[PDB]
Amino acid sequence: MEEECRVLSIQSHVVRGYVGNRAATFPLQVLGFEVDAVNSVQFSNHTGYSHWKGQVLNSDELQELYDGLKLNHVNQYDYVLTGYTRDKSFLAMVVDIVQELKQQNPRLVYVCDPVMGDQRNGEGAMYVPDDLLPVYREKVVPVADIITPNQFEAELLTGRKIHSQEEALEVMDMLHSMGPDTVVITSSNLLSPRGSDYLMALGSQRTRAPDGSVVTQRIRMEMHKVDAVFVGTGDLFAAMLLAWTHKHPNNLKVACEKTVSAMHHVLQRTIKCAKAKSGEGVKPSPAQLELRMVQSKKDIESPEIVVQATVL
Amino acid sequence: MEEECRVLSIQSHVVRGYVGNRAATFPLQVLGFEVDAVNSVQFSNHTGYSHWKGQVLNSDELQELYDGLKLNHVNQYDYVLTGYTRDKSFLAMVVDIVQELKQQNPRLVYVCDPVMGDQRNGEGAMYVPDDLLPVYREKVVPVADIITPNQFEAELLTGRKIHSQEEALEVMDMLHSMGPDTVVITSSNLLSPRGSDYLMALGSQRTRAPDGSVVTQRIRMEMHKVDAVFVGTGDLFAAMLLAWTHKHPNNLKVACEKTVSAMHHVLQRTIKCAKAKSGEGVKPSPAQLELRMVQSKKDIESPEIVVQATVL
Numbered sequence: 046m047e048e049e050c051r052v053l054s055i056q057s058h059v060v061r062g063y064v065g066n067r068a069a070t071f072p073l074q075v076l077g078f079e080v081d082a083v084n085s086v087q088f089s090n091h092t093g094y095s096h097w098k099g100q101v102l103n104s105d106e107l108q109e110l111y112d113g114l115k116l117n118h119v120n121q122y123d124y125v126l127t128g129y130t131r132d133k134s135f136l137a138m139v140v141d142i143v144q145e146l147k148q149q150n151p152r153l154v155y156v157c158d159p160v161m162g163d164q165r166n167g168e169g170a171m172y173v174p175d176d177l178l179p180v181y182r183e184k185v186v187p188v189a190d191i192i193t194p195n196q197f198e199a200e201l202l203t204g205r206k207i208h209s210q211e212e213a214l215e216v217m218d219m220l221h222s223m224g225p226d227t228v229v230i231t232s233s234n235l236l237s238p239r240g241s242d243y244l245m246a247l248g249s250q251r252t253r254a255p256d257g258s259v260v261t262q263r264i265r266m267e268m269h270k271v272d273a274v275f276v277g278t279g280d281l282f283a284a285m286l287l288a289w290t291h292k293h294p295n296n297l298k299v300a301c302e303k304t305v306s307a308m309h310h311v312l313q314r315t316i317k318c319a320k321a322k323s324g325e326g327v328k329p330s331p332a333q334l335e336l337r338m339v340q341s342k343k344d345i346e347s348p349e350i351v352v353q354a355t356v357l
Numbered sequence: 358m359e360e361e362c363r364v365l366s367i368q369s370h371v372v373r374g375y376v377g378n379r380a381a382t383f384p385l386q387v388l389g390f391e392v393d394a395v396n397s398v399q400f401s402n403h404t405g406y407s408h409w410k411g412q413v414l415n416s417d418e419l420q421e422l423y424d425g426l427k428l429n430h431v432n433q434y435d436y437v438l439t440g441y442t443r444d445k446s447f448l449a450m451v452v453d454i455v456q457e458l459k460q461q462n463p464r465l466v467y468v469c470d471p472v473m474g475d476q477r478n479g480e481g482a483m484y485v486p487d488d489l490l491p492v493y494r495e496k497v498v499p500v501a502d503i504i505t506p507n508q509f510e511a512e513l514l515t516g517r518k519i520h521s522q523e524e525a526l527e528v529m530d531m532l533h534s535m536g537p538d539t540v541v542i543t544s545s546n547l548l549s550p551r552g553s554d555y556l557m558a559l560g561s562q563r564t565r566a567p568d569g570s571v572v573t574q575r576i577r578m579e580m581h582k583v584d585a586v587f588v589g590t591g592d593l594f595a596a597m598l599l600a601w602t603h604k605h606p607n608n609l610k611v612a613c614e615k616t617v618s619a620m621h622h623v624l625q626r627t628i629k630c631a632k633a634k635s636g637e638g639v640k641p642s643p644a645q646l647e648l649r650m651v652q653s654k655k656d657i658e659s660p661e662i663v664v665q666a667t668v669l
């Protein structure tokens with residue numbers, strides 16, 4: 046894009062692979078946004094791998110950094126994107142940070158990816174310490190303008206469990222109620238209208254006109270499911286979601302469409318090469334499932350629409 | 358490019374700005390290389406700012422990561438790019454790592470940016486602890502395939518001081534002697550044939566034919582000096598350098614030309630905006646001088662040649 050948009054993305058960093066800031070920075074950059082990256086952690090790779098070693102930051106390490114920026118008077122953003130953290134102290138502090146910033150720039154938008162767990166093999170389990178659920182639930186979502194939760198995470202926040210599209214739609218109403226005006230469930234089990242081989246994603250948006258009226262947007266999408274478990278997809282999503290909604294602040298359908306389309310492309314590209322390195326009748330390993338970002342540069346920049354959002 | 362090239366870049370990371378891995382990753386990426394980033398440090402910004410806070414890694418923290426990669430068997434590269442470190446332990450280990458990799462892969466190329474100091478305001482001073490000079494001088498350069506030293510650093514390594522083009526050409530010879538076969542002094546004071554308002558850069562390359570003959574390449578370049586002190590330029594250079602020489606392994610002139618051209622563009626773009634935010638008759642601050650990476654995406658991908666290298 047051509048306007049001056051700065052984004053303070055606070056997420057995980059992996060030496061190898063695309064997950065965390067690693068999966069979010071490129072997209073936003075090739076998209077035109079100026080990114081300020083704070084890495085909550087530095088691991089060798091993502092925990093999906095059998096082994097993973099690395100380091101983590103605590104509230105003080107985050108303070109040091111922001112203080113640094115603070116001291117130089119360069120703490121001015123237009124957006125804020127947050128993700129992976131294992132430190133409740135760290136997360137809490139972000140909230141304080143986000144707010145001081147929203148005080149300076151009332152126009153700031155805070156995209157929150159409530160990264161806590163995975164909804165795989167049925168219902169799920171979190172992949173971060175439990176002490177964050179409360180923090181995300183009570184201090185973070187409140188102050189978020191856009192959330193990109195997991196069916197799982199989304200159940201985790203609203204404290205319920207989805208078993209129908211409706212039930213889903215309610216959690217989005219509820220979630221909104223907690224703060225965000227734009228809410229997206231990146232995916233879920235909901236018995237898609239067609240095929241078990243299809244992922245469904247729901248996105249709600251609520252706006253208050255200067256006349257008091259509240260214009261509501263509700264969209265459902267059926268994505269073509271890939272026979273694999275990728276990691277970092279969520280992060281790429283939000284990062285791109287942050288870019289399209291900026292383009293179409295009142296077009297959740299469109300913003301989500303581009304976004305999920307880019308998503309499809311990237312993913313199709315990945316599984317292709319993945320199955321190539323694994324061989325026929327052999328399952329791609331997490332290492333072989335890393336997102337083929339660089340290769341998808343053009344698709345990210347201008348994704349052809351391959352998913353048409355249905356307006357509920 | 359269209360082949361599978363992985364690069365293990367080990368350098369500094371700044372939350373805000375383009376410097377260290379922040380300045381090196383994007384270029385290599387939009388250029389086609391698959392990057393693996395290890396951040397030797399994470400600071401708010403670059404030390405050129407009045408204040409800077411952040412954390413640093415030590416040999417153990419680097420080991421962790423390497424071990425992490427090791428354990429998963431993904432410690433396989435085609436290149437290695439190294440830069441900013443303040444830890445001699447860190448630097449040393451990097452070497453051991455480099456060697457273990459060169460054993461596994463004899464075709465690996467190690468680009469080494471001997472980042473230690475600045476040659477500004479006449480003669481300079483290092484911006485890193487002294488204990489690194491020895492390490493760079495005795496353990497790193499020996500094993501490097503391509504160095505991109507600072508007139509200052511270059512002096513620092515060969516232990517001398519340049520006061521003529523010759524004096525320069527010698528040091529490159531001396532440098533080669535220590536190990537690298539491709540050597541580049543990104544810049545120096547040498548009284549350019551035209552203008553004080555011109556930066557001179559010298560690039561030497563030495564190849565050993567299968568017939569025993571040693572083909573030598575020597576090129577000098579006159580760059581148009583910008584009325585400012587940027588930071589991260591060096592890092593950008595090496596990264597791009599790493600990319601063109603990969604394209605033209607036997608065309609130091611060409612590889613250098615593209616790179617430096619890109620450099621010019623990027624830089625021209627930067628000083629322009631910079632002076633805009635500072636105002637007429639007011640000097641751009643280090644914050645206002647951050648490279649305009651993103652904005653230069655296209656120029657990086659295909660830089661028009663605006664500097665013609667002279668073949669000494």
Ligand SMILES: Nc1ncnc2c1ncn2[C@@H]1O[C@H](COP(=O)(O)OP(=O)(O)O)[C@@H](O)[C@H]1O
Binds near residue numbers: 195268269272276279
């Ligand atoms: N297996 C898959 N098949 C098809 N699309 C996927 C698949 N996994 C992720 N996606 C896409 O990437 C995004 C990430 O979804 P999700 O699995 O909920 O991510 P995460 O759990 O990482 O937050 C979704 O918008 C979806 O369209």
Ligand SMILES: Nc1ncnc2c1ncn2[C@@H]1O[C@H](COP(=O)(O)OP(=O)(O)O)[C@@H](O)[C@H]1O
Binds near residue numbers: 507543556582587591
């Ligand atoms: N003031 C400047 N004017 C013109 N070109 C510059 C200027 N500063 C940096 N560059 C370009 O960026 C590259 C980085 O070079 P240099 O500044 O010597 O390295 P470093 O950033 O490591 O000190 C240079 O080789 C040159 O091509």
Ligand SMILES: [Zn+2]
Binds near residue numbers: 161
């Ligand atoms: Zn997620």
Ligand SMILES: [Zn+2]
Binds near residue numbers: 473591592
């Ligand atoms: Zn340098």
